[PDB]
Amino acid sequence: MKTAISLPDETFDRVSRRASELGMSRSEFFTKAAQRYLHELDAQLLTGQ
Template sequence: MKTAVSVPDDIYAHAERVAKTHGLNRSQFYSIAVKRYADELESAELTSAIDAVVELVNADESTASAVSAGRRAIAADDESW
């Protein structure tokens, strides 16, 4: 897919230099850069969600007890196999 974006001159020049140094054409370079940044943002969102759950679990001892009980039940079930 073709698209057009506006990029500041200094960033454009930097991207061109780096792409050339690594044997990439402009499309390859921008595709890699956009994918990596999008993945990084999604990963940060997931990390934040996990951190929120961990904080919630740590704040409530009954939750920790429930998790422990669940782990024991799973371990006991695994032994029956």
């Protein structure tokens, strides 16, 4: 189902700006940023080793 996240005004402006810059939606941006979140976490943890 649809989700509602409580974000600030400056952060919401950045998310909507990079979402329009990439050419995707906000639901698609979250899906790509959720998988890329695991790619960034695994990359940062591996680099810190």
